[PDB]
Short mmCIF file of all heavy atoms in Angstrom, two decimals:
data_model
loop_
_atom_site.label_atom_id
_atom_site.label_comp_id
_atom_site.label_asym_id
_atom_site.label_seq_id
_atom_site.Cartn_x
_atom_site.Cartn_y
_atom_site.Cartn_z
N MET C 1 2.13 89.98 53.50
CA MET C 1 1.25 89.74 54.64
C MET C 1 0.18 90.82 54.74
O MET C 1 -0.20 91.42 53.74
CB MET C 1 2.06 89.67 55.93
N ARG C 46 8.24 93.38 59.61
CA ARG C 46 6.94 93.94 59.26
C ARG C 46 7.13 95.37 58.75
O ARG C 46 7.08 96.32 59.52
CB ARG C 46 5.95 93.92 60.44
CG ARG C 46 5.64 92.59 61.11
CD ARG C 46 5.26 91.51 60.11
NE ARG C 46 5.39 90.17 60.67
CZ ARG C 46 4.54 89.18 60.45
NH1 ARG C 46 3.50 89.33 59.64
NH2 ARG C 46 4.72 88.02 61.06
N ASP C 128 -2.37 91.20 47.45
CA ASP C 128 -3.26 90.04 47.35
C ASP C 128 -4.55 90.27 48.13
O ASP C 128 -5.65 90.05 47.61
CB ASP C 128 -2.55 88.75 47.80
CG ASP C 128 -1.97 88.81 49.22
OD1 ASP C 128 -1.65 89.89 49.76
OD2 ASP C 128 -1.83 87.72 49.82
N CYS C 129 -4.43 90.73 49.37
CA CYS C 129 -5.56 91.25 50.14
C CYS C 129 -5.00 92.10 51.27
O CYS C 129 -3.84 91.97 51.65
CB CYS C 129 -6.46 90.13 50.70
SG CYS C 129 -5.72 89.09 51.97
N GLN C 245 4.26 88.14 73.68
CA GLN C 245 3.85 86.94 74.39
C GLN C 245 2.36 86.65 74.21
O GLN C 245 1.93 85.51 74.43
CB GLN C 245 4.18 87.07 75.88
CG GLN C 245 5.53 87.70 76.12
CD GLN C 245 5.78 87.98 77.58
OE1 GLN C 245 5.94 87.06 78.38
NE2 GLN C 245 5.81 89.25 77.95
N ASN C 247 -0.24 87.92 71.25
CA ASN C 247 -0.44 88.76 70.08
C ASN C 247 -1.91 89.10 69.87
O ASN C 247 -2.81 88.34 70.25
CB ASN C 247 0.12 88.08 68.84
CG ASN C 247 1.62 87.85 68.93
OD1 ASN C 247 2.36 88.73 69.35
ND2 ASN C 247 2.06 86.65 68.58
N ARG C 251 -8.79 93.31 64.35
CA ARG C 251 -9.95 92.43 64.36
C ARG C 251 -10.09 91.75 65.71
O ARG C 251 -11.18 91.32 66.09
CB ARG C 251 -9.83 91.41 63.24
CG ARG C 251 -11.10 90.67 62.93
CD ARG C 251 -11.04 90.05 61.55
NE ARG C 251 -11.54 90.99 60.55
CZ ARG C 251 -12.80 91.37 60.41
NH1 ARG C 251 -13.78 90.81 61.10
NH2 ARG C 251 -13.09 92.34 59.55
N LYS C 252 -8.98 91.64 66.44
CA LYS C 252 -9.01 91.15 67.81
C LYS C 252 -9.81 92.13 68.66
O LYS C 252 -10.61 91.72 69.51
CB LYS C 252 -7.58 91.09 68.36
CG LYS C 252 -7.24 89.96 69.31
CD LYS C 252 -7.14 88.73 68.44
CE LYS C 252 -6.82 87.47 69.18
NZ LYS C 252 -8.01 86.86 69.76
N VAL C 255 -14.00 92.39 67.71
CA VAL C 255 -14.85 91.30 68.15
C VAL C 255 -14.95 91.22 69.67
O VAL C 255 -15.96 90.75 70.20
CB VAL C 255 -14.34 89.98 67.53
CG1 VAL C 255 -13.04 89.56 68.18
CG2 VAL C 255 -15.38 88.87 67.64
N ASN C 256 -13.95 91.72 70.38
CA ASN C 256 -13.89 91.66 71.83
C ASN C 256 -14.58 92.85 72.48
O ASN C 256 -14.93 92.79 73.66
CB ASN C 256 -12.42 91.55 72.27
CG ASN C 256 -12.24 91.21 73.73
OD1 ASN C 256 -12.45 92.03 74.62
ND2 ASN C 256 -11.87 89.96 73.99
N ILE C 258 -17.25 94.89 70.90
CA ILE C 258 -18.52 95.27 70.31
C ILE C 258 -19.50 94.14 70.56
O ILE C 258 -19.57 93.18 69.78
CB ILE C 258 -18.37 95.57 68.81
CG1 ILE C 258 -17.32 96.65 68.58
CG2 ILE C 258 -19.69 96.02 68.21
CD1 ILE C 258 -16.81 96.71 67.17
N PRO C 259 -20.26 94.19 71.64
CA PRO C 259 -21.26 93.15 71.89
C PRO C 259 -22.48 93.33 70.99
O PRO C 259 -23.16 92.36 70.65
CB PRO C 259 -21.62 93.33 73.37
CG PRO C 259 -20.55 94.22 73.92
CD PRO C 259 -20.12 95.09 72.79
N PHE C 260 -22.75 94.58 70.62
CA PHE C 260 -23.90 94.92 69.81
C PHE C 260 -23.44 95.85 68.69
O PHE C 260 -22.75 96.84 68.97
CB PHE C 260 -24.99 95.58 70.66
CG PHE C 260 -25.32 94.81 71.90
CD1 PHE C 260 -24.78 95.17 73.12
CD2 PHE C 260 -26.18 93.72 71.85
CE1 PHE C 260 -25.08 94.47 74.27
CE2 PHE C 260 -26.48 93.01 73.00
CZ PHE C 260 -25.93 93.39 74.21
N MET C 321 8.05 92.72 79.88
CA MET C 321 7.02 92.61 80.89
C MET C 321 6.96 91.24 81.54
O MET C 321 7.86 90.41 81.36
CB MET C 321 5.66 92.93 80.29
CG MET C 321 5.50 94.36 79.85
SD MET C 321 3.90 94.54 79.10
CE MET C 321 2.92 94.37 80.58
N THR C 323 3.75 88.30 83.02
CA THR C 323 2.43 88.00 82.46
C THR C 323 1.31 87.87 83.47
O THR C 323 0.14 87.99 83.09
CB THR C 323 2.51 86.73 81.62
OG1 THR C 323 3.02 85.66 82.42
CG2 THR C 323 3.42 86.97 80.44
N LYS C 324 1.58 87.56 84.74
CA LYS C 324 0.48 87.57 85.69
C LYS C 324 0.15 88.99 86.13
O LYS C 324 -1.02 89.33 86.31
CB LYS C 324 0.77 86.70 86.91
CG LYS C 324 2.13 86.85 87.46
CD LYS C 324 2.46 85.63 88.24
CE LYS C 324 3.92 85.50 88.41
NZ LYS C 324 4.37 85.01 87.08
N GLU C 325 1.17 89.82 86.30
CA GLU C 325 0.97 91.12 86.92
C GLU C 325 0.52 92.16 85.91
O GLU C 325 0.14 93.28 86.28
CB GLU C 325 2.25 91.58 87.64
CG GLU C 325 3.02 90.49 88.39
CD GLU C 325 4.02 89.72 87.54
OE1 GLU C 325 3.91 89.71 86.30
OE2 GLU C 325 4.89 89.08 88.13
N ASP C 327 -2.02 91.10 84.23
CA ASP C 327 -3.41 90.66 84.19
C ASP C 327 -4.12 90.87 85.52
O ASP C 327 -5.28 91.30 85.55
CB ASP C 327 -3.47 89.19 83.80
CG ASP C 327 -2.88 88.92 82.43
OD1 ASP C 327 -2.76 89.87 81.63
OD2 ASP C 327 -2.54 87.75 82.16
N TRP C 344 -23.22 92.40 83.91
CA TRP C 344 -23.74 91.28 83.14
C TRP C 344 -22.79 90.80 82.05
O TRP C 344 -23.17 89.94 81.25
CB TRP C 344 -25.11 91.62 82.57
CG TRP C 344 -25.22 92.92 81.83
CD1 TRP C 344 -25.75 94.08 82.30
CD2 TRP C 344 -24.87 93.16 80.46
NE1 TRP C 344 -25.71 95.05 81.33
CE2 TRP C 344 -25.18 94.50 80.19
CE3 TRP C 344 -24.32 92.37 79.45
CZ2 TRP C 344 -24.94 95.08 78.94
CZ3 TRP C 344 -24.09 92.95 78.22
CH2 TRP C 344 -24.40 94.29 77.97
N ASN C 347 -15.69 89.59 83.53
CA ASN C 347 -14.31 89.89 83.15
C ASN C 347 -14.24 90.69 81.85
O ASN C 347 -13.83 90.20 80.80
CB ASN C 347 -13.47 88.61 83.06
CG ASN C 347 -11.98 88.89 83.03
OD1 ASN C 347 -11.54 90.04 83.13
ND2 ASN C 347 -11.18 87.84 82.88
N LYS C 350 -9.94 92.95 78.03
CA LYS C 350 -9.01 92.31 77.11
C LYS C 350 -7.60 92.77 77.40
O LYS C 350 -7.34 93.98 77.51
CB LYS C 350 -9.37 92.61 75.66
CG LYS C 350 -8.45 91.96 74.63
CD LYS C 350 -8.60 90.47 74.57
CE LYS C 350 -7.75 89.87 73.47
NZ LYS C 350 -7.83 88.39 73.44
N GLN E 15 3.66 78.54 71.82
CA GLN E 15 4.57 78.89 72.90
C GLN E 15 4.75 77.74 73.88
O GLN E 15 5.82 77.62 74.49
CB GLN E 15 4.08 80.13 73.64
CG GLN E 15 4.00 81.36 72.77
CD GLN E 15 3.22 82.48 73.42
OE1 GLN E 15 2.17 82.89 72.93
NE2 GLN E 15 3.73 82.99 74.53
N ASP E 76 6.33 82.65 62.09
CA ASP E 76 7.50 82.98 61.28
C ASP E 76 8.62 83.61 62.09
O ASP E 76 9.75 83.68 61.60
CB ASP E 76 7.12 83.91 60.11
CG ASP E 76 6.29 85.11 60.53
OD1 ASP E 76 6.40 85.59 61.68
OD2 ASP E 76 5.54 85.62 59.67
N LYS E 96 -2.74 83.60 57.11
CA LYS E 96 -2.48 85.03 57.00
C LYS E 96 -3.23 85.87 58.02
O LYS E 96 -2.64 86.79 58.60
CB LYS E 96 -2.83 85.52 55.58
CG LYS E 96 -2.62 87.01 55.40
CD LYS E 96 -2.75 87.44 53.96
CE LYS E 96 -2.60 88.94 53.87
NZ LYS E 96 -2.51 89.43 52.48
N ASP E 98 -5.66 86.28 61.57
CA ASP E 98 -5.99 85.67 62.85
C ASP E 98 -7.48 85.33 62.92
O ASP E 98 -8.32 86.00 62.33
CB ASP E 98 -5.63 86.60 64.00
CG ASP E 98 -5.49 85.87 65.32
OD1 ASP E 98 -5.39 84.63 65.31
OD2 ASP E 98 -5.48 86.55 66.37
N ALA E 100 -9.02 85.47 65.77
CA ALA E 100 -9.39 86.59 66.63
C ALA E 100 -10.60 86.26 67.52
O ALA E 100 -11.67 86.85 67.37
CB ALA E 100 -9.65 87.85 65.81
N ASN E 101 -10.40 85.31 68.44
CA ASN E 101 -11.38 84.88 69.44
C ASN E 101 -12.77 84.62 68.85
O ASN E 101 -13.76 85.25 69.22
CB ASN E 101 -11.50 85.88 70.60
CG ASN E 101 -10.35 85.80 71.58
OD1 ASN E 101 -9.75 86.81 71.94
ND2 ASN E 101 -10.03 84.59 72.02
N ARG E 105 -14.91 81.93 63.02
CA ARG E 105 -13.75 82.27 62.22
C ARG E 105 -12.77 81.12 62.15
O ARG E 105 -12.05 80.97 61.15
CB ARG E 105 -13.07 83.52 62.78
CG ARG E 105 -12.16 84.26 61.82
CD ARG E 105 -12.93 84.88 60.68
NE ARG E 105 -12.12 85.81 59.89
CZ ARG E 105 -12.28 87.12 59.87
NH1 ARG E 105 -13.23 87.70 60.59
NH2 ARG E 105 -11.49 87.86 59.11
N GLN E 176 -10.66 84.24 87.20
CA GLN E 176 -10.25 85.64 87.23
C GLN E 176 -9.35 86.05 86.07
O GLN E 176 -9.70 86.98 85.34
CB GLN E 176 -9.54 85.94 88.55
CG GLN E 176 -10.26 85.43 89.78
CD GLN E 176 -9.54 84.27 90.44
OE1 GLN E 176 -9.05 83.36 89.76
NE2 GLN E 176 -9.47 84.29 91.76
N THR E 179 -8.03 87.30 80.28
CA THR E 179 -7.54 88.21 79.25
C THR E 179 -8.40 88.21 77.99
O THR E 179 -7.89 88.39 76.88
CB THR E 179 -6.06 87.93 78.90
OG1 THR E 179 -5.95 86.76 78.08
CG2 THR E 179 -5.25 87.74 80.16
N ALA E 180 -9.71 88.01 78.15
CA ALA E 180 -10.66 88.04 77.05
C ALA E 180 -12.05 88.22 77.63
O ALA E 180 -12.24 88.17 78.85
CB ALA E 180 -10.59 86.77 76.19
N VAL E 181 -13.03 88.44 76.76
CA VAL E 181 -14.42 88.54 77.19
C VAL E 181 -15.32 87.52 76.52
O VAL E 181 -16.42 87.27 77.03
CB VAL E 181 -14.98 89.96 76.94
CG1 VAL E 181 -14.16 91.01 77.65
CG2 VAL E 181 -15.08 90.22 75.47
N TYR E 210 0.95 80.23 87.75
CA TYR E 210 1.44 81.45 88.40
C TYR E 210 1.61 81.28 89.90
O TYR E 210 2.62 81.72 90.46
CB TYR E 210 0.50 82.62 88.12
CG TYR E 210 0.39 83.08 86.68
CD1 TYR E 210 -0.81 83.58 86.18
CD2 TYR E 210 1.49 83.05 85.84
CE1 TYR E 210 -0.91 84.01 84.88
CE2 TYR E 210 1.40 83.49 84.53
CZ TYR E 210 0.20 83.96 84.06
OH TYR E 210 0.09 84.40 82.76
N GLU E 220 8.92 86.10 91.69
CA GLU E 220 7.86 87.10 91.81
C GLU E 220 7.42 87.62 90.44
O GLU E 220 6.24 87.93 90.26
CB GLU E 220 8.33 88.21 92.75
CG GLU E 220 7.27 89.24 93.20
CD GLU E 220 7.05 90.36 92.21
OE1 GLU E 220 8.01 90.69 91.50
OE2 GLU E 220 5.93 90.90 92.14
N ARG E 221 8.33 87.73 89.47
CA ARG E 221 8.00 88.18 88.12
C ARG E 221 8.51 87.25 87.02
O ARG E 221 9.38 87.65 86.23
CB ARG E 221 8.53 89.60 87.88
CG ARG E 221 7.66 90.74 88.34
CD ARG E 221 8.25 92.06 87.87
NE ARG E 221 9.35 92.48 88.73
CZ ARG E 221 9.22 93.08 89.90
NH1 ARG E 221 8.02 93.38 90.39
NH2 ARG E 221 10.30 93.38 90.61
N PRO E 222 7.97 86.02 86.88
CA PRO E 222 8.17 85.29 85.61
C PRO E 222 7.06 85.55 84.60
O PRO E 222 6.13 86.32 84.87
CB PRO E 222 8.23 83.83 86.04
CG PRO E 222 7.45 83.76 87.29
CD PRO E 222 7.46 85.12 87.93
N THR E 223 7.14 84.90 83.44
CA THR E 223 6.32 85.24 82.28
C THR E 223 5.62 83.98 81.78
O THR E 223 5.59 82.95 82.46
CB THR E 223 7.17 85.87 81.17
OG1 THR E 223 8.17 84.94 80.73
CG2 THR E 223 7.85 87.15 81.64
N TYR E 224 5.03 84.09 80.58
CA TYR E 224 4.44 82.92 79.93
C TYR E 224 5.47 81.84 79.64
O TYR E 224 5.15 80.65 79.69
CB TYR E 224 3.74 83.31 78.63
CG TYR E 224 2.26 83.63 78.75
CD1 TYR E 224 1.73 84.78 78.18
CD2 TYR E 224 1.40 82.75 79.37
CE1 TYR E 224 0.39 85.06 78.27
CE2 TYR E 224 0.05 83.03 79.46
CZ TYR E 224 -0.45 84.18 78.91
OH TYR E 224 -1.80 84.48 78.99
N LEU E 397 -24.95 84.09 82.34
CA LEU E 397 -24.99 85.48 82.76
C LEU E 397 -24.77 86.44 81.60
O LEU E 397 -25.13 87.62 81.72
CB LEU E 397 -23.94 85.67 83.87
CG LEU E 397 -23.75 86.93 84.71
CD1 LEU E 397 -23.20 86.53 86.06
CD2 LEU E 397 -22.77 87.86 84.04
N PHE E 404 -22.25 89.81 72.19
CA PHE E 404 -21.22 89.20 71.34
C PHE E 404 -21.77 88.07 70.47
O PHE E 404 -21.03 87.17 70.08
CB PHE E 404 -20.03 88.69 72.16
CG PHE E 404 -19.51 89.67 73.17
CD1 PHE E 404 -19.89 89.58 74.50
CD2 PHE E 404 -18.61 90.66 72.80
CE1 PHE E 404 -19.41 90.48 75.43
CE2 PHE E 404 -18.13 91.55 73.73
CZ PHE E 404 -18.52 91.46 75.05
N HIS E 406 -23.72 88.66 67.51
CA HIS E 406 -23.79 89.06 66.10
C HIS E 406 -22.51 88.71 65.34
O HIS E 406 -22.56 88.52 64.12
CB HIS E 406 -24.05 90.56 66.00
CG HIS E 406 -22.89 91.40 66.42
ND1 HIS E 406 -22.06 92.03 65.52
CD2 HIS E 406 -22.42 91.71 67.65
CE1 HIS E 406 -21.13 92.70 66.18
NE2 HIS E 406 -21.32 92.52 67.47
N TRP E 407 -21.38 88.63 66.04
CA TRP E 407 -20.14 88.19 65.40
C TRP E 407 -20.23 86.73 64.97
O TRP E 407 -19.75 86.36 63.90
CB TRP E 407 -18.96 88.39 66.35
CG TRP E 407 -18.57 89.82 66.52
CD1 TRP E 407 -18.76 90.59 67.63
CD2 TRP E 407 -17.91 90.66 65.56
NE1 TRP E 407 -18.27 91.86 67.42
CE2 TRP E 407 -17.75 91.92 66.16
CE3 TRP E 407 -17.45 90.46 64.26
CZ2 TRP E 407 -17.13 92.98 65.49
CZ3 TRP E 407 -16.85 91.51 63.60
CH2 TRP E 407 -16.69 92.76 64.22
#
Side-chain angles (χ1 to χ4, degrees), chain C residues 46 128-129 245 247 251-252 255-256 258-260 321 323-325 327 344 347 350, chain E residues 15 76 96 98 100-101 105 176 179-181 210 220-224 397 404 406-407:
Chain C
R46 303 310 161 140
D128 56 335
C129 67
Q245 319 173 69
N247 298 316
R251 194 161 271 290
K252 216 74 181 83
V255 71
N256 191 286
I258 304 162
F260 310 99
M321 293 177 70
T323 56
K324 44 202 160 283
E325 321 86 340
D327 300 340
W344 50 258
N347 195 3
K350 180 69 176 177
Chain E
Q15 298 167 244
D76 49 28
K96 178 171 177 171
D98 200 15
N101 284 131
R105 199 67 169 249
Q176 313 110 317
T179 76
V181 302
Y210 295 147
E220 190 276 331
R221 275 187 281 280
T223 61
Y224 268 131
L397 188 151
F404 312 98
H406 70 103
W407 287 108

